[PDB]
Amino acid sequence: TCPFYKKIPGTGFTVDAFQYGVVEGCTAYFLTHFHSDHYAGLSKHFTFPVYCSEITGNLLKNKLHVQEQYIHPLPLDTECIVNGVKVVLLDANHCPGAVMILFYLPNGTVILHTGDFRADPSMERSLLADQKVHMLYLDTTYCSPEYTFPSQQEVIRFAINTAFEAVTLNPHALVVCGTYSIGKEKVFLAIADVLGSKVGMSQEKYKTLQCLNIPEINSLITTDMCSSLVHLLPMMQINFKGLQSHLKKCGGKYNQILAFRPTGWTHSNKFTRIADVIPQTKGNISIYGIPYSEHSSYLEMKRFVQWLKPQKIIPTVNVGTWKSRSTMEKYFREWKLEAGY
Numbered sequence: 001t002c003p004f005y006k007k008i009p010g011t012g013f014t015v016d017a018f019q020y021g022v023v024e025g026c027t028a029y030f031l032t033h034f035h036s037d038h039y040a041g042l043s044k045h046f047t048f049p050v051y052c053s054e055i056t057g058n059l060l061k062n063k064l065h066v067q068e069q070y071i072h073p074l075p076l077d078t079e080c081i082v083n084g085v086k087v088v089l090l091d092a093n094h095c096p097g098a099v100m101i102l103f104y105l106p107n108g109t110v111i112l113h114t115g116d117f118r119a120d121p122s123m124e125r126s127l128l129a130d131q132k133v134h135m136l137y138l139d140t141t142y143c144s145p146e147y148t149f150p151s152q153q154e155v156i157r158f159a160i161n162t163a164f165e166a167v168t169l170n171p172h173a174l175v176v177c178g179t180y181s182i183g184k185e186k187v188f189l190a191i192a193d194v195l196g197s198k199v200g201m202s203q204e205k206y207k208t209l210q211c212l213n214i215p216e217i218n219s220l221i222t223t224d225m226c227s228s229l230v231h232l233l234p235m236m237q238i239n240f241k242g243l244q245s246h247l248k249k250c251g252g253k254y255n256q257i258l259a260f261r262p263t264g265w266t267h268s269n270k271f272t273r274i275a276d277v278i279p280q281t282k283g284n285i286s287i288y289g290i291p292y293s294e295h296s297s298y299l300e301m302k303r304f305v306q307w308l309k310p311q312k313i314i315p316t317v318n319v320g321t322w323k324s325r326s327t328m329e330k331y332f333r334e335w336k337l338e339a340g341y
């Protein structure tokens, strides 16, 4: 049944609660972003109103075939009224179209649901700065101090430099980038840009990327694999067998693959710097795991919460074990005591 951390008290609202059937006493279903654990349950036979960003709206219509009359897109950074309640959607710095939602309850309570986010100091100057938040429903994916990772900018620098070096040394090398969901598009677009290539991909992936309002996208992507020297493939296929097989497919156009697996965290991060990362190699194939995260590090999360000073924190990730729950509640108390709220 629908867990308490997906219900918004004092409203007829739920967030990311599409796999429990008709939720008793829900008049509007919000969707924070188009990732499968969050949309799980939506389909073309959904007949309740869905509130979301413009981008998430394009994906619901075009990928899931939800009928248009049920899709209610809202602009960002704008005060809107839904079933008599003021709401605002804010950029979550997650994947394209991902939002946080501010709810202004009739009784005066203000609630922030972060959805999935990567906390950034730029958020300290949105409509969030203007009033007090009583309850915070928080993306706690990496809520433990061992989770450090570099900035998205440093990781992209590493990938750009690595790819450019390899292809300039061997013009017959192919670069492959794994994907299994929207998000992390900068990886493959930044690499293609330094190489003067378009990114080649399947028709299903091309379709997905056309929903995202990325400027000049027609100039950056294609379904013609042969004309492109950056290929996207399903993440599952980023391994020596899958890559050997793909190399066969290119018809002796290429004699070397350099591949990138964007991962979240990987325990190599406790000891090693981004400058220091090395590939796994077999023959003429090299695979790089790069720590490109679209979730808050532990320090980013802590800084955001200490700035916001909520009265109550409700975790939405890692809530399934008592040991996880108790670990997280300990960090929340430290944060609050260190900062004085």
Ligand code: NI
Pocket: 033, 035, 094, 116
């Ligand atoms: Ni997500």
